[PDB]
Amino acid sequence: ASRLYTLVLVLQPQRVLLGMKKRGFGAGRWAGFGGKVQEGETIEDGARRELQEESGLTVDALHKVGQIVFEFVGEPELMDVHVFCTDSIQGTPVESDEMRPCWFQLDQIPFKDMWPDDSYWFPLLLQKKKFHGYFKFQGQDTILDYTLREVDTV
Numbered sequence: 001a002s003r004l005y006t007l008v009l010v011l012q013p014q015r016v017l018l019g020m021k022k023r024g025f026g027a028g029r030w031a032g033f034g035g036k037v038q039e040g041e042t043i044e045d046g047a048r049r050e051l052q053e054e055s056g057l058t059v060d061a062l063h064k065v066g067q068i069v070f071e072f073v074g075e076p077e078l079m080d081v082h083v084f085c086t087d088s089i090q091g092t093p094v095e096s097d098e099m100r101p102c103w104f105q106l107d108q109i110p111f112k113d114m115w116p117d118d119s120y121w122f123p124l125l126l127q128k129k130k131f132h133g134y135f136k137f138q139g140q141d142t143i144l145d146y147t148l149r150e151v152d153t154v
């Protein structure tokens with residue numbers, strides 16, 4: 001019914017790293033780093049791998065911050081996105097053919113050029129709150145319905 005994905009936010013005291021995807025799902029938007037979890041791989045190991053593949057950064061500890069289920073009307077598979085954050089990274093962000101990373105000051109997060117759901121849950125991430133969310137999309141731009149609640153255990 002649902003497919004596992006990861007999403008990683010590199011969140012430091014005064015800035016956050018986002019990546020501009022050049023192609024595929026979500027191209028043209030700033031977003032966290034992530035993708036599909038593989039066979040035999042833990043969700044956290046998948047999150048660490050995708051962060052390296054897409055940003056060039058090596059993460060140690062990842063902290064669970066949320067879970068968001070996305071439904072796209074007309075598509076059978078739900079996306080079960082496990083969201084993580086970290087403030088301890090090594091390496092410097094790498095631009096590739098697939099992704100352009102850039103740091104943003106927290107007061108300059110580019111919500112108009114991000115997925116629309118981020119405007120709801122990013123403020124929770126910034127205040128170190130954990131959450132469970134569900135967003136029903138029509139296409140890539142329109143949220144038909146959603147739920148979002150803070151939780152103690154992701």
Ligand SMILES: Nc1nccc(-c2ccccc2)n1
Pocket residue numbers: 005006007031034035070079081115116117118
């Ligand atoms: N912010 C946002 N909105 C919609 C979808 C996603 C997503 C993230 C990781 C993997 C698959 C989808 N992220």
